[PDB]
Amino acid sequence: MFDIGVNLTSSQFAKDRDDVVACAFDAGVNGLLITGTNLRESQQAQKLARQYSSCWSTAGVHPHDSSQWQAATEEAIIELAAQPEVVAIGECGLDFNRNFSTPEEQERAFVAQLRIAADLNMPVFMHCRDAHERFMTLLEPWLDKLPGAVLHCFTGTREEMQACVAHGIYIGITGWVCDERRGLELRELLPLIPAEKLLIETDAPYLLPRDLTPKPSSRRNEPAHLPHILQRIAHWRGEDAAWLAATTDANVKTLFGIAFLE
């Protein structure tokens, strides 16, 4: 198995990062992709990915941080992207929340990063929150000249999922599926996701699985909880966990062009 969504740069891991990674590995997670959400965090992520075996990172600017996009940002992204730890441009995309960055600022930063990924022939690590129509409209002239893309932390409808996978987009499922109140629609479309488009993630330290037992007092999520998520997803899909683990691992290698041990 493989966690495509780990905010390992988070302050929540500052004291025990070596152990968090090692615990993830001891629990059978074969590799991590560390999220970059702005320029400095992307820089930290790449530094951390050097520190551990089977760790990679993304380089980019989250739509929340899109207001900081500048003329020098592109070159900085490319400088990072040139490094072998960096395997995707992102996290980038749209969130209909405009309080931290305007839709104008979001669209501009998003298109800019799609352009970089096309120039570098790299896949994109994407994010879409209540913005499917605008999102696909901007993606359209770029996605086909990209090696691939993932919609990480997918929270859309069944039709929206089907619209995305038609264009090759991988669907990233977190522990939110395990939320009884809030993850129902997600859980119900789950078996309809094509196996070869399915990717798995914790989004640690966030989205601690509600059906996880036992839970920490800190309520901090960690990649070591990935096997729980995979097992729940496999069950709801009516599949063997070992099989889906192999499938999703292949999806990661197909998408990011990386190699890691099974």
Contact criterion met (CB below 8 Å) for 158 and 192: yes
Taking the C-alpha atoms of residue 246 and residue 244, their distance in angstroms, rounded to an integer, is 5
Sign of CA dihedral 7, 109, 40, 123: positive
Distances (CA, A) of 9 to 28, 44, 99, 199: 21, 7, 24, 21
Q: Would you list which residues are annotated within the binding site for a divalent metal cation?
A: 91, 127, 152
What is the experimental resolution, given in Å to one decimal place?
Answer: 2.0
**Which pair of tokens denotes residue 99?**
């309080």
Which technique was the structure solved with, according to the deposited record?
Answer: X-ray
Chain centroid, CA 254 distance in Å:
15
Q: In 3-state terms, what secondary structure has residue 93?
A: strand
User: Where do the domains of the chain lie?
Assistant: 1-262
- Classify domain 1-262 at the CATH superfamily level: Metal-dependent hydrolases (3.20.20.140)
Q: Would you list which residues are annotated within the binding site?
A: 91, 127, 152
Q: What is the CA radius of gyration of the chain?
A: 17
Taking the C-alpha atoms of residue 61 and residue 75, their distance in angstroms, rounded to an integer, is 13
